[PDB]
A = this chain, B = another copy of it.
Amino acid sequence: APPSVFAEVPQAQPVLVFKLIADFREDPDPRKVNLGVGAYRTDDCQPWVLPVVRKVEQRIANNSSLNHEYLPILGLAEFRTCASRLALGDDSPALQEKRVGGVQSLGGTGALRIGAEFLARWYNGTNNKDTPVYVSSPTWENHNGVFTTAGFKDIRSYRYWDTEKRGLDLQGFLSDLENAPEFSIFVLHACAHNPTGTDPTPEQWKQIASVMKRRFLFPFFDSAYQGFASGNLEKDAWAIRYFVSEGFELFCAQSFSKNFGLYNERVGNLTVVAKEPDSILRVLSQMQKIVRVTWSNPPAQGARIVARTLSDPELFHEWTGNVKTMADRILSMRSELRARLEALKTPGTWNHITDQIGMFSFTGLNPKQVEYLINQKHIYLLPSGRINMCGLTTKNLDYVATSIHEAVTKIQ
């Protein structure tokens, strides 16, 4: 019996964040809390289909004029346009000057992948896999994975979090920018940095931009949480817009998974900003080739929902309210968790819980204290000490607060 052609395939390590979702679901323990994946939950600890989304879905379901014929390779035109406008602002000079392109993609991950594939073939030469790629220390793990898969051989880290000050290491960040070879690619979190929840202020962003401009560093923005840093979409897009106004050419990978709560419809957009309009045409032509051999053309449901919402001023307005609701709820949980930990007289400071923005808190728990929490208390979180604040409710706040308190006093 000839051996199987799969005889030697090793067992891969699981994608942790997703593994935890499964683990958590298979947990019979009644006290279990999922503080893993960045997904919104109500105070009832339920998934929330945004009111505007439910409204648009019914409208779509009753629109007999729609068919299922293939979308264009780059995607739904109206979606591409609305998505780019959301990041850049209605008044962007880049939009006026027609030097913006958008490629509908499979969530923020697909936007990152297409961009990385394009750069590996056409940026800083032809098929140059040697240009350094810089990611924050720490970052979302998939940043490494995507760039590695596209072929980049030199992936570096720039200092970002100061474990001591429990904040941004601006000095380290700037030095890392100064030392990077010209033309290096920088993967920047647009807002609500994952996992630290710590973003540069406008003034710090200006310092970062200054070095990047000087050394011809390419900004690759990852905009997965527009609206979650502050509850305001315009405010959260400031950095991107600033770089555009400073005359940078850049990529912006946008995800609508969290701000539209459309996680499973895989709605993303790759926004491209070039110096001149002609370049956009040539870039998009090459992007079509990449898409064609990856997913061929994108799915319609999610993009249709987002296009319908953003293009209807009333719907748009309602949606901004839904986003604010989610952000407001997060603020409230930050306060309550902070308050409780202090009331338990938990060792150390807990101001970082309330200083941090976005969906997460980079708590500071060691990997030993995490293990304790998962195994003993049935509280699921990442090994890094990252917790999803949206997983907290008025009903579980106490269990969590108490469980952290023990981990902290007991596990060293």
Chain A interface residues toward B at CB < 8 A: 1-12, 14-15, 18, 21-22, 37-39, 47, 49, 53, 57-58, 60-62, 67-73, 106-107, 109-110, 113, 122-124, 126, 142, 145-146, 148-149, 183, 216, 218, 249, 257, 261-266, 274-276, 279, 281-283, 285-286, 288-289, 292-302
Contacts and interface: CB of A to CB of B under 8 A. Distances in A.
Most buried by B among A38, A53, A109, A276: A109
A266 B7 CA distance: 32
Contacts of A58: 61
A249 B282 contact: no
A302 to B, nearest CB: 7
Taken together, the copies of this chain in the complex come to 2
Contacts of A21: 70, 72
18 contacts: A5-B124, A5-B183, A6-B122, A12-B288, A18-B70, A18-B73, A39-B70, A49-B68, A61-B61, A69-B263, A106-B294, A109-B292, A110-B295, A113-B293, A113-B294, A145-B292, A265-B300, A266-B298
A91 B288 CA distance: 41
Contact of A274 (B6, B218, B279): B6
B107 A9 contact: no
A5 B218 contact: yes
Please provide the 9 A-B residue pairs with the shortest distance between their CB atoms, ordered closest to farther: A61-B61, A106-B295, A109-B296, A12-B285, A4-B275, A47-B67, A6-B279, A264-B300, A301-B301
A110 B294 contact: yes
B146 A293 contact: yes
A299 B296 contact: no
